[PDB]
């Protein structure tokens, strides 16, 4: 009951005061974040599931000592959901009498909001009622109500820097498979690209890698308008070429217009390729190749 | 009071090999060279052959120290795969955990 919760609250306050004393912190300004940091330090647990780690922190009962429930819709068994439906229906009645990057929350979010359990059909009914509310030319008083149930669904660009020589430049980095590259692109240049201090046509004898390097500058029509110095390590020739391409595109984003940045993002020049080698599993030849199925 | 007579035999072999380790090392070092005369190497060969059979370190078998299993024994823990799996699954072994990646 509420007595047990109040006893737990008092115990938590006393323990918080003891923790503040132990850590030497001020017992007044000893907030929840301080409590969590102190507990993590004093009881260091490396269990991956954060819910299983030690924690010091602060459902209820729907009727008093006389047995009378607090909510008039308690006997429905879903008092929160039906109260919400009743309020929405009342708002719809009021609207009828008087006359994007947002989506509806999922059933789990609705259950968390209403601390109850709801079926799929109940969720669909509530969503349809909310949609009818939205389509009814609802005012701000109901638009805020809708936004209570609404859930929201650009690439950051590095700034230009200056070097000892006086040139204006930007620097970025990228990776592909097991290769990591860091690129420096100058605002003014002559198309020279040097990888690890070596000219690109010598470090990349394969024409495909050179085409991959050309792709970012060619896309925004800036061949020969910049000078690039890249340091790449790991992977093979194609992985290094892809990493250098991604790093060069990310760095060149600092010099092209925002529209060109969006165009490059739509062209895939900025997304990091998550395709990496899949681990071999026991009982099979490769990542997916099973052994020859005998009969 | 070892697990089985095979573990008892292995214990006897280990003790005898440890007892005769230095003599075997010296005689074999006499043998394993191209400097000393061949006749001395031959008498060293017959000497090392005269040593008891169970003193040869090759006869030592790495059995599990708790079930005497001859095969499937991890050298670091000296345990068979079944016993090691049991202890690790119960969590009694520090650090060892299920591998997922």
């Amino acid at each position: 009951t509420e007595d047990f919760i109040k006893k737990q609250i008092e115990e938590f306050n006393i323990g918080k005061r003891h923790l503040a004393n132990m850590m030497g912190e001020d017992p007044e300004t000893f907030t929840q974040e301080d409590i969590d940091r102190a507990i993590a330090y004093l009881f260091p647990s490396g269990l991956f599931e954060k819910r299983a780690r030690p924690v010091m922190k602060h459902r209820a009962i729907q009727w008093g000592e006389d047995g009378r429930p607090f909510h008039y819709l308690f006997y429905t068994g879903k008092q929160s959901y039906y109260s919400l439906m009743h309020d929405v229906y009342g708002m719809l009645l009021n609207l009828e009498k008087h006359q994007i990057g947002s989506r509806w929350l999922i059933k789990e979010e609705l259950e968390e909001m209403l601390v109850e359990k709801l079926s799929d059909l109940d969720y669909m009914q509530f969503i349809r009622l909310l949609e009818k509310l939205l389509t009814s030319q609802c005012g701000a008083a109901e638009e805020e109500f809708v936004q209570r149930f609404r859930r929201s669904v650009k690439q950051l660009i590095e700034p230009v820097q200056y070097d000892e020589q006086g040139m204006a430049f930007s620097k970025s980095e990228g990776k592909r498979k097991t290769a990591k590259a860091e690129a420096i692109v100058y605002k003014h240049g002559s198309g020279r690209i040097k990888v690890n201090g070596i000219d690109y046509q010598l470090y990349f004898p394969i024409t495909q890698d050179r085409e991959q390097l050309m792709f970012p500058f060619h896309f925004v029509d800036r061949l020969g308008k910049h000078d690039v110095t890249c340091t790449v390590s790991g992977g093979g020739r194609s992985a290094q070429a892809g990493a250098i391409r991604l790093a060069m595109a990310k760095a060149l984003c600092s010099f092209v217009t925002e529209d060109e940045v969006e165009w490059m993002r739509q062209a895939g020049l900025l997304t990091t390729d998550p395709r990496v080698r899949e681990r071999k599993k026991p009982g099979q030849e490769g990542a997916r190749r099973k052994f020859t199925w005998k009969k | 009071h070892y697990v089985d007579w095979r573990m008892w035999r292995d214990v006897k072999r280990r003790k005898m090999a440890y007892e005769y380790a230095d003599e075997r090392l010296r005689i074999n070092s006499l043998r394993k060279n191209t400097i000393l005369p061949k006749i001395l190497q031959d008498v060293a060969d017959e000497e090392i052959a005269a040593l008891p059979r169970d003193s040869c370190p090759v006869r030592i078998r790495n059995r599990c120290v708790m079930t005497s299993r001859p095969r499937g024994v991890k050298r670091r823990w000296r345990l068979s795969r079944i016993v090691f799996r049991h202890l690790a699954d119960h969590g009694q072994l520090s650090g060892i955990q299920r591998a997922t990646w």
Partner: protein, 132 residues
């Protein structure tokens, strides 16, 4: 089906502690290791000796405290110090508990040539995490 270190639900009546209720694939995630020593780390030696000593300590404390250990032991090694932390029931009299603590500590210290200590945490009954 995987039968290793798992408790199978039959009627929702069998009480299980936190350790028993979790399958092995939860060791790194929900239940830390019952023993803590540096032997299993990288570049460290004597892992097998520590394992054998831990097994003997568990089998010895289980029989020295018959029907008293509420849950599995916790073995900690710090330098040459060994600490056995045991959750024990309150069935036995404190005189017998202290006698067993002294006896076990002295015998283990003389047997393993290390300063063994034994810390007992008493509980009224076996703590039930859930029923299966």
């Amino acid at each position: 089906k995987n039968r290793a270190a798992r408790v199978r639900v039959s009627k929702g009546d069998k009480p299980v502690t936190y350790e028993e209720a979790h399958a092995p694939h939860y060791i790194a995630h929900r239940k830390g290791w019952l023993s803590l020593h540096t032997g299993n780390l990288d570049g460290e030696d004597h892992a097998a000796e520590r394992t054998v000593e831990d097994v003997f300590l568990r089998k010895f404390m289980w029989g020295t405290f018959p029907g008293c250990l509420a849950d599995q032991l916790v073995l900690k090694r710090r330098g040459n110090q060994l600490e056995i932390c045991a959750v024990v029931l309150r069935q036995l009299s404190p005189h017998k508990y202290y006698f067993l603590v002294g006896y076990s500590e002295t015998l283990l210290s003389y047997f393993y040539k290390c300063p063994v200590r034994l810390h007992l945490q008493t509980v009224p009954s076996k703590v039930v995490y859930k029923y299966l």
